[PDB]
Structure 1
Amino acid sequence: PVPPLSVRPAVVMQGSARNQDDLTHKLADIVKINNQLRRNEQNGAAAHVIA
């Protein structure tokens, strides 16, 4: 479960740079490795690499 935006607000900063919340960054990490792992398990990948 991805939480909504209010649990992880993207606070705006003195300029226009929108700083994201720690949860958003972490979901970025989970998403990237999930997508990358998905393409490996879908394809041929070493069992230790999949592990």
Structure 2
Amino acid sequence: NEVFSRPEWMILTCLPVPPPPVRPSISFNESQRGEDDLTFKLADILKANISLETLE
């Protein structure tokens, strides 16, 4: 559909990030800031993007 889903939109050029409610922080016994796997994956993606930009 030319309005809602164009064929060229299947290629990722701007990846949105979920809000903190989607990936909350796990308090866990004793004061440690355990984080969700989604946050770690987003950080990994950001690091890869920064490395690619610097390398280019």
> Percent same amino acid at aligned positions?
54
Say which structure is richer in helix.
1
Q: Where has structure 1 moved over 4 Å in runs of 4 or more?
A: none
Q: Give the unaligned 5+ runs of structure 1.
A: 42-51
TM-score by length of 1: 0.75
Q: Give the unaligned 5+ runs of structure 2.
A: 1-15
User: Taking CA–CA contacts closer than 8 Å with sequence separation of 6 or more, which of the two structures ends up with the larger relative contact order?
Assistant: 1
| Structure index of larger Rg | 2
TM-score by length of 2: 0.69
Q: What is the total number of aligned residue pairs between the two structures?
A: 41
